Amino acid sequence: AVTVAVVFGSSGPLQTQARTRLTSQNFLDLPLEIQPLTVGVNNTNPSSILTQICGLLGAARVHGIVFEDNVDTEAVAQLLDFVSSQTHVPILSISGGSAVVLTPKEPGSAFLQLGVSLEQQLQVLFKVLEEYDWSAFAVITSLHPGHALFLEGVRAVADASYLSWRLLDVLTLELGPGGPRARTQRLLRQVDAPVLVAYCSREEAEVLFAEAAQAGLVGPGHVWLVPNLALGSTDAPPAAFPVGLISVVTESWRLSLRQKVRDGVAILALGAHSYRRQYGTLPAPAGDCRSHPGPVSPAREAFYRHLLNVTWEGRDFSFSPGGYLVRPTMVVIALNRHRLWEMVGRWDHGVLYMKYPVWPRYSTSLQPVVDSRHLTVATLEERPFVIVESPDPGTGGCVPNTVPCRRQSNHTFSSGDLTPYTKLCCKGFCIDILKKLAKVVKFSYDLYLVTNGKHGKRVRGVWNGMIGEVYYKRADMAIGSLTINEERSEIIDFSVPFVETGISVMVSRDTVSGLSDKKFQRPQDQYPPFRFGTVPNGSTERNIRSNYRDMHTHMVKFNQRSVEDALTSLKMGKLDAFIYDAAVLNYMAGKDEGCKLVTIGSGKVFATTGYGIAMQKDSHWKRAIDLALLQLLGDGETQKLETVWLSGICQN
Amino acid sequence: NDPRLRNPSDKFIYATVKQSSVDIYFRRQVELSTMYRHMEKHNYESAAEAIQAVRDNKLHAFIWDS
Amino acid sequence: AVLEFEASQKCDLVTTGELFFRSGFGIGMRKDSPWKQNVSLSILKSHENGFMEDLDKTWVR
Amino acid sequence: RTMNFTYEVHLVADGKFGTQERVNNSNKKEWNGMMGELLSGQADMIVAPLTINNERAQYIEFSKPF
Amino acid sequence: RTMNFTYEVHLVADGKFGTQERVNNSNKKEWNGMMGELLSGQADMIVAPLTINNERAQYIEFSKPF
Numbered sequence: 001a002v003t004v005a006v007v008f009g010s011s012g013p014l015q016t017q018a019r020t021r022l023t024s025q026n027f028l029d030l031p032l033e034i035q036p037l038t039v040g041v042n043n044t045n046p047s048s049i050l051t052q053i054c055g056l057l058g059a060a061r062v063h064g065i066v067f068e069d070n071v072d073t074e075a076v077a078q079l080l081d082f083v084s085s086q087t088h089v090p091i092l093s094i095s096g097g098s099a100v101v102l103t104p105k106e107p108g109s110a111f112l113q114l115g116v117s118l119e120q121q122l123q124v125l126f127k128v129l130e131e132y133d134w135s136a137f138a139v140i141t142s143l144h145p146g147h148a149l150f151l152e153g154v155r156a157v158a159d160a161s162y163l164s165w166r167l168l169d170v171l172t173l174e175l176g177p178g179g180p181r182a183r184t185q186r187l188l189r190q191v192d193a194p195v196l197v198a199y200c201s202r203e204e205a206e207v208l209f210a211e212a213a214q215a216g217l218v219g220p221g222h223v224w225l226v227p228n229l230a231l232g233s234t235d236a237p238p239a240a241f242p243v244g245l246i247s248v249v250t251e252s253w254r255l256s257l258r259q260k261v262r263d264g265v266a267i268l269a270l271g272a273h274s275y276r277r278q279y280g281t282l283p284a285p286a287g288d289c290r291s292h293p294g295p296v297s298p299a300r301e302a303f304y305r306h307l308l309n310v311t312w313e314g315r316d317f318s319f320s321p322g323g324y325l326v327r328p329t330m331v332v333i334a335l336n337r338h339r340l341w342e343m344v345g346r347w348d349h350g351v352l353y354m355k356y357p358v359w360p361r362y363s364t365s366l367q368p369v370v371d372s373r374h375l376t377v378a379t380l381e382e383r384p385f386v387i388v389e390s391p392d393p394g395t396g397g398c399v400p401n402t403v404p405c406r407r408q409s410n411h412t413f414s415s416g417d418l419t420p421y422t423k424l425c426c427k428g429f430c431i432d433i434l435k436k437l438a439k440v441v442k443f444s445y446d447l448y449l450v451t452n453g454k455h456g457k458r459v460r461g462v463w464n465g466m467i468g469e470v471y472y473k474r475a476d477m478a479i480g481s482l483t484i485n486e487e488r489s490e491i492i493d494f495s496v497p498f499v500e501t502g503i504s505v506m507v508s509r510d511t512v513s514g515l516s517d518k519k520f521q522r523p524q525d526q527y528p529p530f531r532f533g534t535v536p537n538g539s540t541e542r543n544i545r546s547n548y549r550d551m552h553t554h555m556v557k558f559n560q561r562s563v564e565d566a567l568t569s570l571k572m573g574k575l576d577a578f579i580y581d582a583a584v585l586n587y588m589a590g591k592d593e594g595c596k597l598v599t600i601g602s603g604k605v606f607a608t609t610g611y612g613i614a615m616q617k618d619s620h621w622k623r624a625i626d627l628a629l630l631q632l633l634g635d636g637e638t639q640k641l642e643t644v645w646l647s648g649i650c651q652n
Numbered sequence: 653n654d655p656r657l658r659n660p661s662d663k664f665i666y667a668t669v670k671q672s673s674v675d676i677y678f679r680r681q682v683e684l685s686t687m688y689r690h691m692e693k694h695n696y697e698s699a700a701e702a703i704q705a706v707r708d709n710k711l712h713a714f715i716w717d718s
Numbered sequence: 719a720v721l722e723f724e725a726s727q728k729c730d731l732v733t734t735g736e737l738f739f740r741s742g743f744g745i746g747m748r749k750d751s752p753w754k755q756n757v758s759l760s761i762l763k764s765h766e767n768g769f770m771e772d773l774d775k776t777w778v779r
Numbered sequence: 780r781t782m783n784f785t786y787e788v789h790l791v792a793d794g795k796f797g798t799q800e801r802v803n804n805s806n807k808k809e810w811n812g813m814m815g816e817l818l819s820g821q822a823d824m825i826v827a828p829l830t831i832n833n834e835r836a837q838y839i840e841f842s843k844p845f
Numbered sequence: 846r847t848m849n850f851t852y853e854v855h856l857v858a859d860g861k862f863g864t865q866e867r868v869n870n871s872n873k874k875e876w877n878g879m880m881g882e883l884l885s886g887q888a889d890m891i892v893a894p895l896t897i898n899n900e901r902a903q904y905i906e907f908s909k910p911f
């Protein structure tokens with residue numbers, strides 16, 4: 001029974017839009033008999049808007065109005081707000097220039113723009129800068145009205161953030177059509193910031209990007225971020241816009257006009273339905289232009305309050321008291337190589353989920369140049385050295401001292417764009433070593449775990465694990481519990497061993513007191529068989545197979561699968577000797593309630609080696625990383641890491 | 653510097669008072685992150701409650717003013 | 719290693735405290751030596767099978 | 780035997796492992812002992828308990844520790 | 846008595862010494878407990894075992910330690 005008026009301001013196929021709708025049989029999902037009434041203004045000038053809305057409102061006792069126009073319009077929002085103030089009719093502006101947020105809205109007016117504020121866009125853009133570790137940005141604004149609000153917003157967002165933002169400079173340019181160009185060209189040649197945040201209209205955006213191209217600020221070493229205002233129709237980006245331009249829009253950016261009209265009518269219907277369900281009657285229709293209802297008439301105010309908070313199809317259309325969308329689902333889009341507005345990230349709740357764990361950079365047209373100081377590091381969880389955690393959904397990110405890491409997976413478990421890659425957080429001894437190396441050698445890096453194998457094993461001539469990743473050029477280097485031996489050192493380069501290790505035997509309480517003991521060499525000789533085994537596919541298994549054939553043949557039976565499972569079996573009594581890596585066995589012995597003892601003092605490490613950072617053969621990072629590790633060892637920082645990570649309860 | 657505090661476990665339970673100077677001290681330090689998380693999981697509302705918990709074996713160690 | 723061997727063989731002397739600068743002994747060659755890789759591989763193989771343990775037993779018990 | 784090369788062995792002249800020192804009225808510092816012998820060309824390879832550290836590694840290639 | 850000022854003593858509402866916590870959705874940070882009472886204006890003086898540290902000293906003025 002509720003009547004909703006749909007006003008079309010688009011100057012293109014207006015008749016087509018009018019003919020597509022006005023059928024009341026549509027909108028059956030809503031729990032009301034929607035009565036749509038089309039208008040379709042012609043030239044969307046002030047006189048036409050006022051006359052058509054007044055003729056519409058004073059005739060059909062309409063409840064609400066849904067308005068849509070093109071992105072070219074600038075002052076239409078003010079006129080719509082003025083009409084709403086005069087007639088107290090709820091309005092829903094969807095798409096176009098009328099959806100750009102007007103912060104101060106005529107206190108007694110129900111305008112309710114379906115757009116997002118400038119400070120919310122700034123929040124999302126600064127979260128994007130946080131994600132890729134981009135600081136030292138610069139702000140470029142034009143004489144466009146409202147740039148002062150933009151500067152206030154950037155300063156407030158930068159100050160109210162844990163990361164130490166460093167704004168280099170702000171500079172204001174005329175950016176007018178056909179005017180002073182040398183004046184702005186002089187200033188644009190002095191900008192040194194690698195990240196540039198701009199605020200201007202579409203035409204000023206095109207002029208600014210042309211001048212920036214003349215000044216060489218468009219190449220692969222410059223990132224531009226702009227709000228929705230700078231871009232216009234996303235369907236046809238202009239030629240001046242550079243690739244990699246980043247912006248943040250709402251989730252309805254890819255919806256058709258019919259879908260947006262349906263959403264607006266749904267919001268009005270749900271508001272009216274809630275109001276009727278509470279008050280037992282439908283809200284009163286709006287007034288007329290030939291009067292001024294001075295009082296708010298709390299019947300109207302209650303309906304406005306009900307219109308504020310609305311949920312529809314699992315999407316939150318909750319409206320701020322400032323009459324704009326609050327806590328909305330935002331997406332972060334960018335202009336790709338094909339000059340299309342591709343979707344990059346999402347802003348579900350207060351958490352950022354974006355593809356491209358490393359931001360791709362293109363040299364102008366093509367040739368996606370790769371950063372020379374960005375290393376791709378492979379690893380996996382080992383417990384004393386690499387620990388993975390899920391970041392807290394409440395805070396979005398994860399605690400400091402914990403580097404963000406990702407899983408080794410492509411777009412097949414994503415099932416679209418819900419979670420393209422698993423975002424975890426890694427910490428531990430090796431991660432601390434990596435952070436120190438990054439701060440000393442001065443390189444950037446990402447971090448991804450390994451899902452094909454664990455450590456490395458030449459299976460039919462093909463390597464898996466970290467050694468496989470590094471050998472096949474998929475990762476620049478691998479860190480973690482990676483032991484140095486001859487077979488791996490032939491294939492790839494290894495750094496200096498920063499932590500000593502080797503083969504060690506763990507027993508539960510001297511029993512054998514040596515790897516070359518009689519019990520290990522000939523278990524099958526007599527007595528209840530000595531039950532000793534190991535986790536296969538590692539340095540220890542390789543060493544045992546290459547040196548002692550009979551022992552390996554006997555240990556084939558007790559082929560354990562996990563270190564924890566092996567300790568459980570050792571405690572239960574299913575085996576009495578466990579042969580593994582010394583660095584991890586010492587840690588496992590230290591933090592034990594029963595205080596398991598290594599087979600001899602200090603374990604008597606056999607086949608002494610160390611953990612190394614595997615690198616591609618003949619790589620240029622080898623010498624720098626070796627020198628950095630030796631410096632860390634000399635300064636005693638590795639000792640501090642060992643104290644804070646490898647300390648044991650009953651090692652003493 | 654005891655290894656038990658630096659290696660938190662479910663069996664050992666140590667904490668302090670919420671919204672106090674000890675919270676700031678452990679939060680600002682980076683090398684005390686694991687201890688900070690373990691303490692935050694079991695922080696008490698007041699000093700008297702933590703003392704009583706220590707007497708009642710519900711809490712193993714209480715970190716507070718000298 | 720040297721101090722521990724001296725204390726063990728000569729007696730009358732004792733080593734005190736924990737190791738405060740852990741490192742290793744390595745064969746030194748000129749920078750970018752062509753056979754640095756071969757020396758490193760040979761040393762790794764000697765560690766792996768039995769040779770370093772045999773040398774340790776023979777010379778510095 | 781493994782790498783198939785013959786050799787001739789000699790002792791270090793001054794009986795020092797090696798360090799960098801600046802004698803007065805010198806334009807630069809120079810390594811002494813075994814390090815100086817290897818850098819100057821008197822030796823091709825150092826087979827001795829030579830410690831691996833950052834200062835020496837800048838001028839000298841080290842094998843994996845034995 | 847020494848400075849001849851009258852006083853009236855009241856206990857802090859939430860019984861917390863005071864730290865900085867962000868408002869709900871990662872908004873501006875505010876002080877809890879006695880520090881918040883002093884900063885907001887509900888109290889003119891904090892007479893309690895309040896520990897002197899850097900974070901609190903940026904906003905309030907501490908006396909010499911008693």
Ligand SMILES: *[C@@H]1O[C@H](CO)[C@@H](O[C@@H]2O[C@H](CO)[C@@H](O[C@H]3O[C@H](CO)[C@@H](O)[C@H](O)[C@@H]3O)[C@H](O)[C@H]2NC(C)=O)[C@H](O)[C@H]1NC(C)=O
Pocket residue numbers: 752753756
């Ligand atoms: C480090 O060890 C490497 C493996 O033993 C060794 O590579 C080997 O080099 C010899 C050359 O002396 C190659 O022999 C080939 O070339 C000679 C001379 O051209 C021919 O007369 C032979 O018939 C043969 O075709 C070996 O093939 C080669 N081995 C491998 C696996 O590539 C390095 O030379 C050693 N590095 C040194 C000595 O500095």
Ligand SMILES: *[C@@H]1O[C@H](CO)[C@@H](O[C@@H]2O[C@H](CO)[C@@H](O)[C@H](O)[C@H]2NC(C)=O)[C@H](O)[C@H]1NC(C)=O
Pocket residue numbers: 274278302305306309
């Ligand atoms: C949306 O907000 C309105 C306004 O606060 C809510 O309406 C209130 O509902 C409570 C629930 O019984 C009543 O006690 C109030 O009298 C209502 N106020 C008004 C002005 O109507 C409404 O419930 C909210 N809707 C949802 C889904 O939370």
Ligand SMILES: *[C@@H]1O[C@H](CO)[C@@H](O[C@@H]2O[C@H](CO)[C@@H](O)[C@H](O)[C@H]2NC(C)=O)[C@H](O)[C@H]1NC(C)=O
Pocket residue numbers: 453454459535536537561
């Ligand atoms: C050690 O390596 C072997 C062989 O690569 C692994 O055995 C494979 O286990 C997977 C189970 O995920 C099977 O799908 C493969 O068919 C097995 N391969 C063979 C040749 O049988 C074994 O799981 C590895 N052990 C580890 C990683 O602990």
Ligand SMILES: *[C@@H]1O[C@H](CO)[C@@H](O[C@@H]2O[C@H](CO)[C@@H](O)[C@H](O)[C@H]2NC(C)=O)[C@H](O)[C@H]1NC(C)=O
Pocket residue numbers: 783
């Ligand atoms: C070890 O080195 C000796 C000499 O350095 C090698 O003897 C000769 O090496 C030359 C070098 O090419 C060959 O042309 C000759 O044929 C070798 N002599 C003989 C009798 O074969 C010797 O071959 C080397 N051993 C190896 C490479 O295993």
Ligand SMILES: *[C@@H]1O[C@H](CO)[C@@H](O[C@@H]2O[C@H](CO)[C@@H](O)[C@H](O)[C@H]2NC(C)=O)[C@H](O)[C@H]1NC(C)=O
Pocket residue numbers: 848849
């Ligand atoms: C608190 O005490 C001080 C002195 O201990 C007072 O200061 C003076 O008090 C004498 C009383 O004989 C007055 O005649 C003076 O005029 C006071 N001087 C000043 C500068 O105030 C002080 O007045 C007392 N505070 C009160 C009474 O509120």
Ligand SMILES: *[C@@H]1O[C@H](CO)[C@@H](O)[C@H](O)[C@H]1NC(C)=O
Pocket residue numbers: 042043
């Ligand atoms: C006004 O609308 C009519 C049809 O509704 C259309 O034919 C006419 O072109 C419009 N006016 C302008 C200036 O486009």
Ligand SMILES: *[C@@H]1O[C@H](CO)[C@@H](O)[C@H](O)[C@H]1NC(C)=O
Pocket residue numbers: 409410411412
């Ligand atoms: C994606 O990952 C799966 C493993 O889940 C793998 O089987 C597949 O080959 C991968 N596709 C790629 C890398 O294109």
Ligand SMILES: *[C@@H]1O[C@H](CO)[C@@H](O)[C@H](O)[C@H]1NC(C)=O
Pocket residue numbers: 803804
């Ligand atoms: C400088 O070096 C020369 C070299 O023999 C020495 O004779 C002289 O005494 C030195 N001067 C000093 C130490 O002041």
Ligand SMILES: *[C@@H]1O[C@H](CO)[C@@H](O)[C@H](O)[C@H]1NC(C)=O
Pocket residue numbers: 869870
């Ligand atoms: C805001 O904070 C209050 C008090 O801690 C809490 O109850 C509420 O759940 C929070 N809401 C959000 C959206 O964070």
Ligand SMILES: N[C@@H](CCC(=O)O)C(=O)O
Pocket residue numbers: 455456481482483484537538539540541580581582
């Ligand atoms: N880090 C080991 C794996 C575990 C071990 O062998 O101790 C390796 O190089 O394969």
